[PDB]
Amino acid sequence: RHNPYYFHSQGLRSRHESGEGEVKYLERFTERTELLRGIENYRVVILEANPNTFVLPYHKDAESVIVVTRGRATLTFVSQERRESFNLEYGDVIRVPAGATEYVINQDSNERLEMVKLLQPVNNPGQFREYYAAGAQSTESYLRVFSNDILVAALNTPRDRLERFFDQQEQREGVIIRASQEKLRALSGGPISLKSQRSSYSNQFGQFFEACPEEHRQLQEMDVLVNYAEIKRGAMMVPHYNSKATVVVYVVEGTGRFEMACPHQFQKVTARLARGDIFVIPAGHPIAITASQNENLRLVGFGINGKNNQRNFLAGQNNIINQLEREAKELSFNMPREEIEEIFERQVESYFVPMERQ
Template identity: 35%
Template sequence: MTMTKKLIITLLLLISIAFVHCLAFHVELEEFEPPRQEEQEAPVGEGSGEGWQEESTSEFPYHFRKRSFKNWFQSKEGFVKMLPKFTKRAPNLFRGIENYRFSLYDMEPNSFLVPLHLDADSVVIILQGHGVAEFVTAKTKELFHLTKGDVVRLPSGITHFAINTNQTVPLRFAKITIPVNNPGQFQNYFSAPSQFQQSYFTGFSKEVLSASFNIPEELVGRIFFGPQQMGQGIMRRITPDQIKELTENSTSPSNKHKDKSTKFSPFSLFTHDSVSSYTNDFGHFHEAHPESFDQLQDLQIAVTWTNMTQGSVFLPQYNSKATFVTFVENGCARYEMASPYSFQGEQQQQQWWPEQGEEKEEDMSGQVHKIVSRVCKSDVFIIPAGHPFTIVSHDENFVSVGFGIYASNSIRTFLAGQGNVLSNLDTVATRVAFGVGSKVAEKLFTSQNYSHFAPTTPSHQQS
């Protein structure tokens, strides 16, 4: 009996030891198990169109989601966000626009952007609110009142400041910037110190500044080097009385001489006679060409505003020379674009993200790839020159603005709708090219009842 108990105890001990070893081995395996691959982004919700798939950002360089922006400045008075250089995403694909930077500004009510200048030219479009911008030179001081849809040229080196004069609504604007020193890189030069930005006067000795301004060195140190402004950012809250003083002391030659336009003068995309506009019940489109505006001509920049109603399509089209950086101000829409480049799979990614110094060979395969992406508020989408594209608004009204790069003499060509370019093809050419009969050839490109914008459902089409 004693021997039997000893055997049982020994057997139990052996089983326990084996179990512990197995458990340790299992834990050890778990600790060294390779991490699971992260799940891809969840599918887009319903109402975004049938049978389309959204590409992930890592595989699809044209679409910059709002999380792609980097905070350059942020406080309770507002923020400045900027996209990284386009060539960071795809060095070869965006080589032609590597010198251009896109940024977004948001100023809270009764806020003041302190005076500064840039080593870059800029074009600004007001997205929301009301404000004032003042440009200062050695001889002039010009103030301009700005509202939604206004376009402003900021020449390189011009000293300027901005005020949100609205007491309830933020002043929001988008900006395309063209550096003049280093491609894709520019600097902001502030005259006054702030929490994160030194005054450019700190680049001089107090002795030089004292002699330059004919003031004591102690005052120089207090104004330009002192801590009195260091608790505030480049955007500051000001009182309505201060706003009144600033606007009263400024002149506005654009108001006095409405027929006289300068490179400083803003213009409205909605009301200016030289803006090209397409409009019907399903959408509105406004485009300022560089040939028509002195403010844009030397920069070769075009500016657009697109407003689409729910359930509409901006008919297929392309731009002959301009590459557009489009920013979504409101809503969501489906962008479809025909591209000769594929971005699916590891091989294609390696082709478009080459090592430094490598060149990508031209793709002569003749394949067309369907680029489809759901683009929503605060996203950016790049439309290269020559790429046919369309925009489909499904669940809500959709608003976007665009900056066209290299837009001089660029022609916007529509591929569908009344008056589209293919409707001018000779019927015989259509018949031969598409392999259709005479009756189909006559109606193939002439059956659409609308121009530029159309409904997505046939029931809304005119008879």
């Protein structure tokens, strides 16, 4: 692919070194194509940590919006003089400020943890780096970069012990390490529950939840909306488009398909969806997504430029055509009022519909 808006999961760059888990990096949106220049300063990172693990502390040149797509975790980050710690749930959304030192705990013994993060670099556009205070055989501590003279004077500690301190770190391999279930238990505004949002619509064929920045202060920094959609098997999300937001969508679970009308006159942009896949819906593009016939398709999405965004549906009871006056409809479609009704007033549900008519 060879699809300008579609990113297959095996195209993700896997961090070397990962250890007891894996960290994957999505490439730059402007790497293979120029059609995504509008969001060049956005990167996607997927973190997965094994049961009973500890993610080493670090900070990065980027703001972050985090979605827990699998399992649970305890997330803690420090900044200046404040420390904040939260127990994160499935579908929980949390913000981690740029420069804040962050570490993660997987306190569960059975279910593997997965986190999907949208990053907004503060330095060079679309470029970020991770800074580790304590490293491994394969991750250098940024403290070890300084000359010995600086460190012994700054910390007021003898030279011999500092190199003991650094050798203790070149013992472990990976920024994700195995840990006791006993220490991890001790280490335990707030998280945003997607399936608890007021902005939602659900029927027999799917459910939709969305957290908009206007109601959540922590989403106002990156100016981003975060939404969740489950399309039941054999169903679809009806054709619609976003007025303003450019949505980056991650396939959490299942398989399916999407069709997009792209004028970059028009052309049908389409791709097969599977777990780990990522695709982008630039604003204005009308989009339709179908689940598979045998399993549900579950998606989480990040809405870049999400303030005051409006989702306009082209089919269903809430469709926009239905807001035109009768004369406007007739003039636009070159048909009488009743033959227009036969097209835009025969669907009784919204958002999600079955591929087999009823």
